[PDB]
Amino acid sequence: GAFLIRTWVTLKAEQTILPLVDEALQHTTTKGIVFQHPEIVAHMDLMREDLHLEPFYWKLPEQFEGKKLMAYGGKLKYAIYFEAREETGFSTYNPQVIIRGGTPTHARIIVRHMAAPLIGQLTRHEIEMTEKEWKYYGDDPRVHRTVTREDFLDILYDIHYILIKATYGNFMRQSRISEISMEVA
Amino acid sequence: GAFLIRTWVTLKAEQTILPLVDEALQHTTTKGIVFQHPEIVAHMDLMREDLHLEPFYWKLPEQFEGKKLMAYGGKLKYAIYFEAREETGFSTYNPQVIIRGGTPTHARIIVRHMAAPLIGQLTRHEIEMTEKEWKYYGDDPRVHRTVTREDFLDILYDIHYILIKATYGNFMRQSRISEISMEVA
């Protein structure tokens, strides 16, 4: 359908680091994260005591949350760069993007899968903020379905968090994110 | 050195209009200001009670304020359009942009003059955020100076407000602004 971009949700101009959340979704790490302008850079060897908790996700800040109906039809964009020893054969075990949202009695988590970026390649992802390619978190492996338009829109009615994968490949040494924006009409 | 843009400060997702103020900020209004995609449109007939205060200025929102050293060397851009009885009016000599900033007890006001826009035309402005073409507010017409590097940077250290003129011509009917951005490193 038509989407006329009005503006974008972004990090604040002065916001130069983001926290990492662990794979258990229960611990936040800031140590080891350095702004190396223009990128936010996580150095695995500078967060050794938390490495046992990987994989990690970047947690977007709170301006991306709440009522985001106006984002329906637009793109979530960001740029990833990572260095690792080799690729994993299975970059879908951990979704690329995780969003929780929704109104009372309807809240739920949905996930978006993407092929991992190539090692060493600054990679600009564009994730359409509509239902088509999204999956429900926690579906049994025998259940093969996609997210409904109504559920996607209920989630956008009240976003609770947006997480972007930070861990890629085997023996990842560093990972970077920049150029984060979400279009709104 | 050269200024190297990283991103822009733009309107936020929740900001679809901006208020008008008089040049001294004695009065503020949003009556008669409407978002008419893609522009912010001020209809003077809907604030007839306030017109005695012209010229009016758009007041940029809070994310353009505060510590804006990062903007030094960048460009402030926007697009304007107006309708009026006459293309040129009494306020053509009032500044296009006004910035106040600095420490609370050493605040200073600077101004930027621009060519007059043609009536009924979309006119784009670019204002470099360096001192060369800026003047001190209220300077005596008997003297001819421009703003020093120190004074300009003192203001960017802590911007209090940025005003962009909204009144053009004589008996202005409507004015519009769009495409608002400020480059930051």
Side-chain angles (χ1 to χ4, degrees):
Chain A
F3 181 86
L4 310 169
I5 302 166
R6 179 172 49 83
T7 194
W8 301 264
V9 185
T10 67
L11 273 42
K12 297 181 157 78
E14 72 276 8
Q15 199 149 45
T16 66
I17 55 183
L18 287 176
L20 292 174
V21 177
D22 70 339
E23 197 200 44
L25 307 180
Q26 294 175 54
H27 188 267
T28 291
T29 296
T30 56
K31 286 187 298 198
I33 305 172
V34 183
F35 188 57
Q36 306 184 183
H37 77 90
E39 298 177 289
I40 300 174
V41 185
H43 289 281
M44 298 301 108
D45 284 340
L46 297 179
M47 47 178 85
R48 289 189 188 168
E49 57 178 327
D50 282 0
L51 272 187
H52 73 282
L53 298 176
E54 78 180 351
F56 298 109
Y57 283 77
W58 301 108
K59 190 188 83 63
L60 294 192
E62 66 283 350
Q63 62 267 36
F64 290 85
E65 297 169 8
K67 188 173 282 181
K68 289 301 186 293
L69 300 167
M70 56 179 65
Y72 184 80
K75 299 167 177 182
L76 173 66
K77 291 183 180 182
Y78 54 87
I80 299 298
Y81 172 89
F82 77 97
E83 292 181 350
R85 195 178 76 176
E86 65 260 349
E87 298 184 300
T88 66
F90 307 93
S91 69
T92 65
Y93 181 81
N94 291 114
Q96 178 68 40
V97 186
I98 305 174
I99 296 184
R100 188 176 196 267
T103 61
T105 81
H106 306 293
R108 69 194 76 246
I109 304 168
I110 60 169
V111 303
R112 182 76 164 78
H113 298 279
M114 292 287 274
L118 295 178
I119 291 166
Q121 186 62 33
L122 181 57
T123 295
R124 293 171 173 100
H125 279 178
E126 296 191 350
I127 306 303
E128 183 176 289
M129 297 294 290
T130 70
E131 62 285 346
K132 186 73 171 289
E133 303 283 323
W134 292 79
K135 310 296 192 271
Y136 295 101
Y137 179 70
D139 277 1
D140 189 273
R142 291 96 139 196
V143 169
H144 305 151
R145 71 182 175 153
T146 58
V147 177
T148 64
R149 175 174 292 241
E150 145 195 268
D151 285 353
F152 194 87
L153 282 167
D154 184 84
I155 288 165
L156 292 186
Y157 195 95
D158 178 24
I159 294 179
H160 302 158
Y161 59 75
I162 307 180
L163 311 179
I164 298 172
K165 187 151 72 168
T167 300
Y168 306 87
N170 290 331
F171 293 106
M172 188 184 79
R173 283 182 55 257
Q174 64 171 266
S175 174
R176 312 185 180 203
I177 192 165
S178 61
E179 308 178 3
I180 299 165
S181 67
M182 181 167 76
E183 294 172 348
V184 298
Chain B
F3 178 85
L4 300 177
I5 187 174
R6 177 172 59 87
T7 189
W8 297 263
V9 183
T10 53
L11 296 195
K12 291 178 176 188
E14 72 275 11
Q15 295 169 351
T16 57
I17 60 165
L18 290 176
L20 291 171
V21 298
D22 65 314
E23 183 171 339
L25 302 94
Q26 290 171 356
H27 302 78
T28 187
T29 190
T30 58
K31 284 198 314 201
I33 307 177
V34 176
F35 177 66
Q36 305 192 172
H37 157 81
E39 299 173 288
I40 299 168
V41 184
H43 300 272
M44 297 292 109
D45 68 340
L46 289 173
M47 37 178 301
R48 278 184 64 182
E49 328 85 9
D50 295 335
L51 294 180
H52 61 293
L53 280 91
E54 77 173 12
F56 300 111
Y57 287 77
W58 302 110
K59 185 172 187 206
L60 288 188
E62 290 170 9
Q63 70 274 18
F64 288 88
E65 300 171 351
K67 192 169 194 174
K68 289 298 195 291
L69 303 173
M70 63 173 86
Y72 184 73
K75 292 144 170 90
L76 171 67
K77 293 183 193 190
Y78 53 86
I80 59 173
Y81 170 94
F82 78 104
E83 299 172 0
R85 181 182 290 180
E86 297 152 28
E87 176 172 71
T88 299
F90 296 106
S91 65
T92 191
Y93 309 106
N94 295 73
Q96 183 62 38
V97 186
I98 303 174
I99 301 186
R100 190 184 88 192
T103 65
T105 68
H106 300 285
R108 298 297 290 283
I109 314 171
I110 61 170
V111 302
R112 184 72 162 82
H113 295 269
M114 296 286 282
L118 295 184
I119 196 159
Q121 301 299 334
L122 185 68
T123 300
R124 291 186 174 90
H125 284 183
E126 173 182 289
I127 291 92
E128 182 170 285
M129 295 292 287
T130 68
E131 67 278 7
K132 184 184 191 86
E133 306 289 345
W134 290 73
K135 299 202 78 92
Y136 292 97
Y137 187 94
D139 253 16
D140 197 316
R142 288 153 258 259
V143 311
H144 304 280
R145 63 177 173 154
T146 57
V147 175
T148 68
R149 184 158 295 204
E150 174 185 305
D151 287 345
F152 194 89
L153 285 164
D154 264 347
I155 287 167
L156 267 56
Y157 174 81
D158 178 29
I159 295 182
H160 304 166
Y161 59 78
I162 308 175
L163 310 184
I164 298 167
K165 189 158 68 170
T167 296
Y168 309 93
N170 198 37
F171 295 86
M172 192 181 74
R173 172 188 316 144
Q174 61 161 242
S175 176
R176 310 187 188 171
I177 192 166
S178 61
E179 307 176 6
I180 301 167
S181 70
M182 184 168 73
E183 300 184 335
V184 297

Short mmCIF file of all heavy atoms in Angstrom, two decimals, chain A residues 82 87-88 91 96 114-119 123 125 165 168-169:
data_model
loop_
_atom_site.label_atom_id
_atom_site.label_comp_id
_atom_site.label_asym_id
_atom_site.label_seq_id
_atom_site.Cartn_x
_atom_site.Cartn_y
_atom_site.Cartn_z
N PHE A 82 30.16 -6.66 11.53
CA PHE A 82 30.73 -7.56 12.55
C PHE A 82 31.96 -8.25 11.99
O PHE A 82 32.13 -8.41 10.79
CB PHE A 82 29.74 -8.52 13.12
CG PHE A 82 29.44 -9.68 12.23
CD1 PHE A 82 30.08 -10.90 12.39
CD2 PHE A 82 28.49 -9.57 11.27
CE1 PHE A 82 29.83 -11.99 11.54
CE2 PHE A 82 28.25 -10.62 10.38
CZ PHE A 82 28.89 -11.81 10.54
N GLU A 87 31.07 -18.17 9.38
CA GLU A 87 29.64 -18.07 9.48
C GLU A 87 29.11 -19.26 10.20
O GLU A 87 29.78 -20.35 10.23
CB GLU A 87 29.02 -18.00 8.11
CG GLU A 87 29.46 -16.78 7.33
CD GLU A 87 28.77 -16.66 6.01
OE1 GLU A 87 28.91 -17.61 5.16
OE2 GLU A 87 28.02 -15.67 5.82
N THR A 88 27.92 -19.09 10.77
CA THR A 88 27.20 -20.22 11.29
C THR A 88 26.28 -20.70 10.15
O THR A 88 25.76 -19.89 9.33
CB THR A 88 26.31 -19.80 12.46
OG1 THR A 88 25.33 -18.94 11.94
CG2 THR A 88 27.15 -19.01 13.50
N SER A 91 21.80 -18.99 10.74
CA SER A 91 21.55 -17.65 11.28
C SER A 91 20.05 -17.35 11.56
O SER A 91 19.70 -16.15 11.70
CB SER A 91 22.18 -16.58 10.35
OG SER A 91 21.52 -16.47 9.08
N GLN A 96 16.65 -11.96 13.66
CA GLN A 96 17.30 -10.71 13.45
C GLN A 96 16.67 -9.56 14.24
O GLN A 96 17.38 -8.67 14.75
CB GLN A 96 17.26 -10.42 11.98
CG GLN A 96 17.90 -9.06 11.59
CD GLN A 96 19.39 -9.12 11.83
OE1 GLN A 96 20.07 -10.11 11.57
NE2 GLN A 96 19.95 -8.04 12.32
N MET A 114 16.36 -12.89 9.09
CA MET A 114 17.14 -12.35 7.95
C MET A 114 18.41 -13.23 7.86
O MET A 114 18.93 -13.66 8.88
CB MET A 114 17.58 -10.90 8.17
CG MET A 114 16.48 -9.81 8.19
SD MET A 114 15.81 -9.47 6.53
CE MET A 114 16.97 -8.29 5.96
N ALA A 115 18.91 -13.44 6.67
CA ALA A 115 20.22 -13.98 6.49
C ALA A 115 21.22 -13.07 7.21
O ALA A 115 21.13 -11.87 7.11
CB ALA A 115 20.60 -14.04 4.97
N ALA A 116 22.22 -13.64 7.85
CA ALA A 116 23.21 -12.83 8.55
C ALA A 116 24.00 -12.04 7.49
O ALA A 116 24.28 -12.53 6.36
CB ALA A 116 24.17 -13.68 9.34
N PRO A 117 24.44 -10.83 7.81
CA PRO A 117 25.40 -10.09 6.96
C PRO A 117 26.64 -10.94 6.74
O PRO A 117 27.01 -11.75 7.59
CB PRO A 117 25.74 -8.86 7.80
CG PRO A 117 24.52 -8.65 8.68
CD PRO A 117 24.16 -10.08 9.03
N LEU A 118 27.33 -10.70 5.64
CA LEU A 118 28.64 -11.21 5.45
C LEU A 118 29.60 -10.65 6.52
O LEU A 118 29.49 -9.47 6.90
CB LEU A 118 29.18 -10.81 4.05
CG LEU A 118 28.40 -11.44 2.90
CD1 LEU A 118 28.99 -10.94 1.61
CD2 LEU A 118 28.40 -12.91 2.92
N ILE A 119 30.57 -11.43 6.94
CA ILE A 119 31.64 -10.98 7.86
C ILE A 119 32.35 -9.77 7.17
O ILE A 119 32.71 -9.79 6.01
CB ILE A 119 32.63 -12.10 8.11
CG1 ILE A 119 31.97 -13.20 8.92
CG2 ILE A 119 33.83 -11.56 8.84
CD1 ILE A 119 32.72 -14.52 8.97
N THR A 123 26.46 -3.50 6.45
CA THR A 123 25.27 -4.04 5.82
C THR A 123 24.03 -3.28 6.27
O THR A 123 23.68 -3.30 7.46
CB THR A 123 25.15 -5.52 6.18
OG1 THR A 123 26.25 -6.23 5.63
CG2 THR A 123 23.86 -6.15 5.58
N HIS A 125 20.27 -3.00 6.52
CA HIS A 125 19.00 -3.74 6.49
C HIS A 125 17.81 -2.77 6.45
O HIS A 125 17.85 -1.70 7.06
CB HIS A 125 18.82 -4.59 7.77
CG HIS A 125 19.56 -5.89 7.73
ND1 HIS A 125 19.57 -6.78 8.78
CD2 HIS A 125 20.25 -6.47 6.73
CE1 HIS A 125 20.26 -7.85 8.43
NE2 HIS A 125 20.68 -7.69 7.19
N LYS A 165 19.50 -8.04 16.55
CA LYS A 165 20.60 -8.96 16.82
C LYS A 165 21.97 -8.29 16.75
O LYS A 165 22.25 -7.48 15.87
CB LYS A 165 20.51 -10.10 15.85
CG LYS A 165 21.49 -11.24 16.10
CD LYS A 165 21.03 -12.55 15.68
CE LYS A 165 21.08 -12.51 14.24
NZ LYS A 165 20.92 -14.00 13.57
N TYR A 168 26.68 -12.44 15.61
CA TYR A 168 26.66 -13.14 14.34
C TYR A 168 27.90 -14.00 14.21
O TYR A 168 28.98 -13.58 14.66
CB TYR A 168 26.66 -12.11 13.21
CG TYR A 168 25.58 -11.05 13.26
CD1 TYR A 168 25.77 -9.90 13.98
CD2 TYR A 168 24.41 -11.20 12.56
CE1 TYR A 168 24.81 -8.92 14.06
CE2 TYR A 168 23.42 -10.23 12.60
CZ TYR A 168 23.64 -9.10 13.37
OH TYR A 168 22.66 -8.14 13.35
N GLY A 169 27.81 -15.09 13.50
CA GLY A 169 28.97 -15.91 13.21
C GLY A 169 29.49 -16.67 14.41
O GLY A 169 28.96 -16.65 15.50
#
